[PDB]
Amino acid sequence: KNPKSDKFKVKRFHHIEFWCGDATNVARRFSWGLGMRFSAKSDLSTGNMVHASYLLTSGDLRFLFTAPYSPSLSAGEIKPTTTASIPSFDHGSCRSFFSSHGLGVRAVAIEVEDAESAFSISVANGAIPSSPPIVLNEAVTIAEVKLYGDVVLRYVSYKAFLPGFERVEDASSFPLDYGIRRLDHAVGNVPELGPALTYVAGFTGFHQFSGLNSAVLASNDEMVLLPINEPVHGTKRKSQIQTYLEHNEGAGLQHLALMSEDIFRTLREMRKRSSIGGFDFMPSPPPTYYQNLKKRVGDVLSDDQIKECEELGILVDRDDQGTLLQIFTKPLGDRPTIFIEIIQRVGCMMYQSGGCGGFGKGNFSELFKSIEEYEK
Amino acid sequence: KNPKSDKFKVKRFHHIEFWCGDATNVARRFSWGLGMRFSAKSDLSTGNMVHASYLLTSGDLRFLFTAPYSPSLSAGEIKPTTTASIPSFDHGSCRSFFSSHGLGVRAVAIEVEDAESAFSISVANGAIPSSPPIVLNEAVTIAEVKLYGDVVLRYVSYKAFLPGFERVEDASSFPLDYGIRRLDHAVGNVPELGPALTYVAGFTGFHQFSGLNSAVLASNDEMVLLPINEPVHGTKRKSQIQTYLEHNEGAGLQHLALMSEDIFRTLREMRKRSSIGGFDFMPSPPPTYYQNLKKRVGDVLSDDQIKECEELGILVDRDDQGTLLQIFTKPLGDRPTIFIEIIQRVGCMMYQSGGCGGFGKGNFSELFKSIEEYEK
Numbered sequence: 001k002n003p004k005s006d007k008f009k010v011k012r013f014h015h016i017e018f019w020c021g022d023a024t025n026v027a028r029r030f031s032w033g034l035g036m037r038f039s040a041k042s043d044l045s046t047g048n049m050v051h052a053s054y055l056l057t058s059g060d061l062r063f064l065f066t067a068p069y070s071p072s073l074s075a076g077e078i079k080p081t082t083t084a085s086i087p088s089f090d091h092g093s094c095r096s097f098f099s100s101h102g103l104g105v106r107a108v109a110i111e112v113e114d115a116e117s118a119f120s121i122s123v124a125n126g127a128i129p130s131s132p133p134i135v136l137n138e139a140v141t142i143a144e145v146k147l148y149g150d151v152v153l154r155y156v157s158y159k160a161f162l163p164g165f166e167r168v169e170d171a172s173s174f175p176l177d178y179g180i181r182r183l184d185h186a187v188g189n190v191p192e193l194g195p196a197l198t199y200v201a202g203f204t205g206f207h208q209f210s211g212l213n214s215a216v217l218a219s220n221d222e223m224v225l226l227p228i229n230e231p232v233h234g235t236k237r238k239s240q241i242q243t244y245l246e247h248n249e250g251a252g253l254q255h256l257a258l259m260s261e262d263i264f265r266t267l268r269e270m271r272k273r274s275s276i277g278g279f280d281f282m283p284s285p286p287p288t289y290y291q292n293l294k295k296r297v298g299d300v301l302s303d304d305q306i307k308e309c310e311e312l313g314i315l316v317d318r319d320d321q322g323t324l325l326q327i328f329t330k331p332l333g334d335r336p337t338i339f340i341e342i343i344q345r346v347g348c349m350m351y352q353s354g355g356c357g358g359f360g361k362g363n364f365s366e367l368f369k370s371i372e373e374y375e376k
Numbered sequence: 377k378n379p380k381s382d383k384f385k386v387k388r389f390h391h392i393e394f395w396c397g398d399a400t401n402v403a404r405r406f407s408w409g410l411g412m413r414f415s416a417k418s419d420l421s422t423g424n425m426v427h428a429s430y431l432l433t434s435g436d437l438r439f440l441f442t443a444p445y446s447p448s449l450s451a452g453e454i455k456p457t458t459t460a461s462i463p464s465f466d467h468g469s470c471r472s473f474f475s476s477h478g479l480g481v482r483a484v485a486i487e488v489e490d491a492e493s494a495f496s497i498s499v500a501n502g503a504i505p506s507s508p509p510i511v512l513n514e515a516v517t518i519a520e521v522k523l524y525g526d527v528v529l530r531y532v533s534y535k536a537f538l539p540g541f542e543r544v545e546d547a548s549s550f551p552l553d554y555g556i557r558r559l560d561h562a563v564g565n566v567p568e569l570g571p572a573l574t575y576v577a578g579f580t581g582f583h584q585f586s587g588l589n590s591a592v593l594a595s596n597d598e599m600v601l602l603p604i605n606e607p608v609h610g611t612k613r614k615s616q617i618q619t620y621l622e623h624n625e626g627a628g629l630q631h632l633a634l635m636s637e638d639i640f641r642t643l644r645e646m647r648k649r650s651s652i653g654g655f656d657f658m659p660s661p662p663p664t665y666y667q668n669l670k671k672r673v674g675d676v677l678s679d680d681q682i683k684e685c686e687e688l689g690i691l692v693d694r695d696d697q698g699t700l701l702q703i704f705t706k707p708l709g710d711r712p713t714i715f716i717e718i719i720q721r722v723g724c725m726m727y728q729s730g731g732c733g734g735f736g737k738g739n740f741s742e743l744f745k746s747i748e749e750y751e752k
């Protein structure tokens with residue numbers, strides 16, 4: 001069931017903003033590891049004395065990396081005279097976020113039809129305001145409300161990246177591309193799932209789509225997908241959600257799932273780079289898992305395609321409507337907190353429906369099953 | 377003249393430690409950009425609940441990247457019970473350093489014969505203590521005194537990387553190598569050269585070897601080389617030293633000069649990677665500079681070798697004893713502060729004497745000369 005209860009018009013995920021200590025080094029690492037191109041900047045070279053912000057893109061996926069400069073560079077500014085291109089930015093908030101949580105996502109940004117209206121309706125329906133609507137160059141409106149922990153849901157609306165950002169020079173914009181095309185879902189970890197769902201669904205009208213309980217909130221067309229997890233305590237192996245909350249100093253964004261148009265190419269390219277500056281992947285499932293794939297998805301993937309899944313460590317799950325291929329990186333930074341998922345979905349062709357094939361929850365059983373089997 | 381006045385026995389540069397917000401991302405970026413291999417780690421996986429530290433090596437060059445975890449992970453520890461592998465580390469100092477200066481060098485480490493003696497003699501001769509001598513696993517002694525700004529001079533001595541560090545697994549240790557072999561010199565920027573030189577030369581006994589004044593302090597065999605620069609004010613173009621001090625919030629390390637055994641190979645490899653996660657280089661000199669090279673170094677470099685210098689943007693300088701090839705990166709991070717120099721020295725064969733060919737001070741005139749000439 002989909003009651004289509006969105007309280008304002010939501011379009012698609014727009015960007016993800018990481019708050020960093022040094023944006024240059026994180027952005028360069030991510031560009032090489034994920035095959036994303038440098039496409040826009042706002043920094044000292046563009047007149048921004050407040051923050052350094054670098055935008056990477058792959059298809060429709062936009063990752064923004066921001067870090068504060070010394071406050072002394074902008075000490076004479078006030079908000080009416082600011083050189084910041086993102087008016088919600090604050091030095092103290094950024095340093096506090098980073099000190100508390102380490103490298104991670106500060107903003108999940110969605111494009112809406114009217115960011116001032118979305119903000120107004122959200123706050124009228126219980127959202128905690130974070131940054132009020134601000135109109136940039138009479139062209140773009142941006143507003144922020146609290147999502148969970150110190151993560152904000154950012155609303156962006158366009159009259160027709162952001163004013164004050166400059167498209168980057170060609171030489172610095174090497175056209176890397178490993179096949180990633182858009183953000184599929186963004187997942188939060190919280191101590192208590194119930195209150196988190198009630199809060200977010202309360203202000204958005206989004207509907208509902210071992211070691212954890214999870215539920216997914218979705219927009220009307222189910223293209224904005226926000227799963228939320230809570231830990232389950234007292235378990236034999238300690239909950240990975242609880243480890244996250246301990247190392248992150250509380251709730252925050254757990255993972256970003258990035259859709260690829262060719263997951264085999266994406267994983268070939270990312271794995272070639274794991275040990276030369278890129279991203280590592282979690283341990284692969286045992287060969288029993290791939291033996292057991294013929295019975296589960298043998299009508300969807302050929303033996304060769306199943307073998308390619310095994311060469312790359314790709315997991316497969318299936319629901320009533322479609323099939324999903326997925327794989328998980330090791331944590332992106334020092335702390336065992338945020339990671340990335342690469343995904344590709346098969347089925348639900350109408351365009352493809354959002355969330356086709358689910359989120360892989362069946363792989364909890366199949367991995368557990370496969371590991372024991374593998375002891376053999 | 378070299379009075380050989382070292383107040384304690386100094387061997388060679390040992391390592392450089394960067395204080396970071398996220399050590400993983402900086403270390404991975406530097407590994408790919410400079411061709412350095414991951415060789416040791418101290419982090420959660422090795423029992424360190426305090427800091428994450430990753431060591432990269434190329435030949436004898438050792439770069440260490442350290443960032444703090446949440447203090448909550450180690451809140452029950454005291455110094456006698458610490459899980460930190462570097463006992464001088466402090467969460468508050470690290471966060472304060474990074475907030476003030478951004479990404480940069482915290483420690484210039486030199487190997488000495490006895491770090492406790494070096495510390496004692498240094499402090500007896502005016503050094504400001506930073507961390508007292510601590511014996512690690514009855515095998516290594518480490519001590520720190522203030523160098524300039526928030527940079528420390530770290531003394532390391534070995535009875536026979538550090539205890540508590542683990543050599544990294546093979547798969548994560550891809551054997552990158554672009555030819556870099558050791559640290560040649562490490563350069564500080566200060567507001568006032570005179571007092572800085574008097575302080576450092578006072579406690580070490582090291583001897584003395586537009587927009588700035590500079591002087592170089594050197595150990596007995598002139599293999600530890602510490603240039604220091606101050607700004608010259610009132611100049612037409614604003615001093616790059618003053619820009620550094622403004623953006624860094626005061627004195628700190630300006631550049632690390634890395635010796636290559638084959639500068640042409642190093643620059644070919646680094647430039648191939650500039651736009652795919654590596655390091656950018658400062659603007660190249662005009663072709664007039666390379667035309668003028670035949671008269672200056674035509675007895676040292678062939679026409680082909682001069683042409684290779686022009687293809688790569690390499691600068692050349694010469695003193696009375698040898699010739700130096702050098703080139704400079706753009707700043708390593710967000711702020712226009714720290715950068716890297718790649719160098720190779722020709723001459724002064726006895727082994728090669730330290731500092732053979734100087735530090736390139738003649739290139740200030742030759743670039744100024746060449747730029748005007750180039751207007752032609």
Ligand SMILES: Cc1ccc(C(=O)CN2C(=O)CSc3ccc(C(O)=C4C(=O)CCCC4=O)cc32)cc1
Nearest residue numbers: 187214227240328329330331339359360361363364
């Ligand atoms: C560092 C690190 C820490 C933890 C992990 C994982 O938990 C990866 N993972 C497994 O290991 C067991 S199969 C699995 C199946 C689905 C998902 C998943 O994506 C979601 C969602 O999207 C929303 C619904 C619930 C869910 O969990 C994750 C899985 C990976 C790396």
Ligand SMILES: Cc1ccc(C(=O)CN2C(=O)CSc3ccc(C(O)=C4C(=O)CCCC4=O)cc32)cc1
Nearest residue numbers: 563590603616704705706707715735736737739740
């Ligand atoms: C971001 C950035 C900011 C500034 C720069 C430079 O100043 C680079 N540079 C020039 O541009 C003009 S030639 C030149 C010659 C020598 C040196 C040099 O290495 C030293 C020393 O080692 C110790 C002695 C004095 C010195 O300056 C540096 C030079 C490069 C990048």
Ligand SMILES: [Co+2]
Nearest residue numbers: 187257341359
């Ligand atoms: Co997922």
Ligand SMILES: [Co+2]
Nearest residue numbers: 563633717735
């Ligand atoms: Co130099």
